[PDB]
Amino acid sequence: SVRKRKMNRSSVGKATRRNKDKQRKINIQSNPIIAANWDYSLTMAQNYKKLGLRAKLQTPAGGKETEVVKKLEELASRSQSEREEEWLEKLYKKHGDDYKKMFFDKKLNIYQQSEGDLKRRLLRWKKRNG
Amino acid sequence: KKGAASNRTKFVRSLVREIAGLSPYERRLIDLIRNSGEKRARKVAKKRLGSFTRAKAKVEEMNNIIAASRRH
Amino acid sequence: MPLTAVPEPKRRFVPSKNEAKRVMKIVRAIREGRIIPPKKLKEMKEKEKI
Amino acid sequence: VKWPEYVRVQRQKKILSIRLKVPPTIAQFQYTLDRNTAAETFKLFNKYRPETAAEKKERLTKEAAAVAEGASPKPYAVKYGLNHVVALIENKKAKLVLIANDVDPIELVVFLPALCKKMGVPYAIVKGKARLGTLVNQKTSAVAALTEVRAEDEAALAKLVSTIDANFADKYDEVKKHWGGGIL
Amino acid sequence: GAYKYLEELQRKKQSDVLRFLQRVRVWEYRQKNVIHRAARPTRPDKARRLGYKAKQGFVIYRVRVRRGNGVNELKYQRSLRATAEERVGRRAANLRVLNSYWVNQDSTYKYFEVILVDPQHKAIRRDARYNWICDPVHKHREARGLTATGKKSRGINKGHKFNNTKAGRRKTWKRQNTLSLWRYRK
RNA sequence: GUUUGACCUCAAAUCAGGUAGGAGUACCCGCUGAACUUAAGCAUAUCAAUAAGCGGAGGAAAAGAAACCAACCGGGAUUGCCUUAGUAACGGCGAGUGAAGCGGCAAAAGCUCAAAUUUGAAAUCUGGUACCUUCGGUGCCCGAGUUGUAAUUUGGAGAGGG
RNA sequence: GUUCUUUGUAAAGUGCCUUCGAAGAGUCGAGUUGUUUGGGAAUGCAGCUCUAAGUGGGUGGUUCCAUCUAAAGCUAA
Known part of the structure; x- marks a missing residue:
């Protein structure tokens, strides 16, 4: 070649990268339970059937509870603002439970909200209080 | 739901139709309906436009220009 | 009649929530202290530029 | 004398604006609202300046400085976008729609006077997009509308409608006819 | 809205309004340069549905191209519109x-x-x-x-x-x- | 008012800040485009939608989420490989040219604007500028912008209320 | 993993009821000369003439039926 001829002749030095052994054996990353139980001497599909998990949901072309219990173990195992709370304080102290009157009030229910919104928000207020 | 009616676009097309006036051939076409009739009107429209189905919709469109302008 | 029968939204009658968003953003900025309130801004010029 | 290129172009465009016969949906402009009625339209419209960016910023910091430490009606302003004005006509919420006579592409606002006559919206083609711009915190506005109003200004607005109907729409019933620009 | 009124307006091109608009503007564009910049779109409706947002960074350039092409029918099989697009691509290379x-x-x-x-x-x-x-x-x-x-x-x-x-x-x-x-x- | 002021368009500036050219070019996207040859001598045709020429990109490019294929008991973006298959079709029906759907497989992924008012509020953005925890953030100011920047909406609907 | 922040009557999703509800034009198309394809069905494209419609429009299949949504844009392997 033209450029390669000079680069193999120059005293600059080649940017040699030996990244061939890293192409075959890539470490499993996304799950530490799988990361501890993965036999690197076995292949991908062999390490799936060893653990139990299905590797391909479509039936493959060609010819083909030890750990899943640990997964099952770790898988079987919204507050209100100061102003919103004080707003619901005002509504309860002036009305109580008359949601028709409570939502037809122009002074406290400035946002013309329904009855269902009011009873839900007040019960959130009542659960967090006495 | 091929060409869903759309009350607004029918209004808009007809709103622009009355404002913009008529193209010089359509201006001849509406004179040609009153004098010579739909026979020669469709003949000129077919030569002017692409196909016969074009000339159907166009002469009828112009007949509705006349039907609204004269009566109502 | 108007051309379309579009139902009018709640927000056209209720006090605006974009306004409420901006107000409750400046509120945070005052708690944090990065916006000095309009009342104290007079006091910053009553003491300075004399 | 010898003028520049652009000066010659705008002078040529000025004389071209006169000397051509023009379609009646244009020249429905320039048959516009006279000096007294224009001044009286703005004597109302100036009372509803949309709250300028500085005024809005200072007030909403006043809300924060007060309400965070220790009821209002919906305020009325003029409505000013073409998407929004042609939205408001056909709602039908517009009581007075003001239309500029000088628009950069003329084709923009050609449907608007006749759509206003269709909907029954009392429109007035007023002179100057700059003059509309002034009442609305913008350089230019093309359109300005007055949906709702304070009751103090309500009777004045209703009379502004009736004055514009009589002054504009009745004097210019001939303007839907007659191709403009036959000046010799 | 407002652009549906515009869209259906520009579908009528030989109609007397748009006939007059096109008569004035064809002459006015001849008086200017071949490739020059437009202040704003003439058809803002069609600009917007082709994806023009009227914001900082968005440019409208107006461009002119000769029409046409058996010596006078030695063809040149590329469009007029692609020729125009390329010329504005070179004058405005950024x-x-x-x-x-x-x-x-x-x-x-x-x-x-x-x-x-x-x-x-x-x-x-x-x-x-x-x-x-x-x-x-x-x-x-x-x-x-x-x-x-x-x-x-x-x-x-x-x-x-x-x-x-x-x-x-x-x-x-x-x-x-x-x-x-x-x-x-x- | 014979004055003053809005705009519109067009300029300039060693203005502030940016950006384009040239190289390489195997592959990739375009434009432009022959001939020797081969056909029986030969305007079609063939070599060939090739070589040469010109432009334009990247690690891939292009293509791509149907104005698709089908005719089924229907499939479902593209691209690629096996198959279709030297088949259908084209051609002095001559030399010759010559696919695609289906089936298998590789790989797979979906989405976004414009068009219906935020109108109880241009909610949007760039720059300058002073700080800070600096691929940025915050404050203030000049602007862009209603001839439309934001949020919502894209047919698989979708939106406003309850 | 540990830890600091979260907020505002803030942003969503599910199912039902109730009220509405637009979809890319010198573009499709037609003619036409030229190029191009396996494309005889006139396969694509380019130039020029003329130039549409919205119970639209395109593409196929023996009285009709099926299947797409053009003329706007992005996207790995």
Whole structure:
């Protein structure tokens, strides 16, 4: 070649990268339970059937509870603002439970909200209080 | 739901139709309906436009220009 | 009649929530202290530029 | 004398604006609202300046400085976008729609006077997009509308409608006819 | 809205209003340069549905091209619209040609209004709807026919009818004209 | 008012800040385009939608989420490989040219604008500028912008209320 | 993993009821000369003439039926 001829002749030095052994054996990353139980001497599909998990949901072309219990173990195992709370304080102290009157009030229910919104928000207020 | 009616676009097309006036051939076409009739009107429209189905919709469109302008 | 029968939204009658968003953003900025309130801004010029 | 290129172009465009016969949906402009009625339209419209960016910023910091430490009606302003004005006509919420006579592409606002006559919206083609711009915190506005109003200004607005109907729409019933620009 | 009134207005081109508009503007565009910049779109409706947002970084250039091509029918099989798009691509080399539309036509010249985005503008580099144009795979889309009209002239679509040019006619020619030989001969 | 002021368009500036050219070019996207040759001598045709020429990109490019294929008991973006298959079709029906759907497989991923008012509020953005925890953030100011920047909406609907 | 922040009557999703509800034009198309394709069905494209419609329009299949949504844009392997 033209450029390669000079680069193999120059005293600059080649940017040699030996990244061939890293192409075959890539470490499993996304799950530490799988990361501890993965036999690197076995292949991908062999390490799936060893653990139990299905590797391909479509039936493959060609010819083909030890750990899943640990997964099952770790898988079987919204507050209100100061102003919103004080707003619901005002509504309860002036009305109580008359949601028709409570939502037809122009002074406290400035946002013309329904009855269902009011009873839900007040019960959130009542659960967090006495 | 091929060409869903759309009350607004029918209004808009007809709103622009009355404002913009008529193209010089359509201006001849509406004179040609009153004098010579739909026979020669469709003949000129077919030569002017692409196909016969074009000339159907166009002469009828112009007949509705006349039907609204004269009566109502 | 108007051309379309579009139902009018709640927000056209209720006090605006974009306004409420901006107000409750400046509120945070005052708690944090990065916006000095309009009342104290007079006091910053009553003491300075004399 | 010898003028520049652009000066010659705008002078040529000025004389071209006169000397051509023009379609009646244009020249429905320039048959516009006279000096007294224009001044009286703005004597109302100036009372509803949309709250300028500085005024809005200072007030909403006043809300924060007060309400965070220790009821209002919906305020009325003029409505000013073409998407929004042609939205408001056909709602039908517009009581007075003001239309500029000088628009950069003329084709923009050609449907608007006749759509206003269709909907029954009392429109007035007023002179100057700059003059509309002034009442609305913008350089230019093309359109300005007055949906709702304070009751103090309500009777004045209703009379502004009736004055514009009589002054504009009745004097210019001939303007839907007659191709403009036959000046010799 | 307002643009539906505009859209259906510009569908009537020989109608007396738009006839007059086009009469004035064709002459006015002759008096200017060949490629010059437009202050704003003449057809803002069609600009916007071709993706013009009226914000900082968005440019409208107006362009003029000669019409036509058996010496006088020695063909030149590329469009007038692609020629126009390329010329504005060279005068405004910092921009990226987004789309273009027809504005006015004549015996000698067809006019267009190209729409251009500034990929170096920070109002384009943020906002995740338009920052795709900053990716260097869009350096001169108009020179490789990646615009609307270029994809038309290339004949890129779907179906039976575009089999000779669906992945590009050069690609499909090179693929189907290849003696593919395997290790164990088929 | 014979004055003053809005705009519109067009300029300039060693203005502030940016950006384009040239190289390489195997592959990739375009434009432009022959001939020797082969056909019986030969305007079609063939070599060939090739070589040469010109432009334009990247690690891939292009293509791509149907104005697709089909005719089924229907499939479902593109691209690629086996198959279709030297089949259908083209061609002095001559030399010769010559696919695609289906089936298998590789790989797979979906989405976004414009068009219906935020109108109880241009909610949007760039720059300058002073700080800070600096691929940025915050404050203030000049602007862009209603001839439309934001949020919502894209047919698989979708939106306003309850 | 540990830890600091979260807020505002803030942003969503599910199912039902109730009220509405637009879809890319010198573009499709037609003619036409030229190029091009396996594309005889006139396969694509380019130039020029003329130039549409919205219970639209395109593409196929023996009285009709099926299947797409053009003329705007992005996207790995």
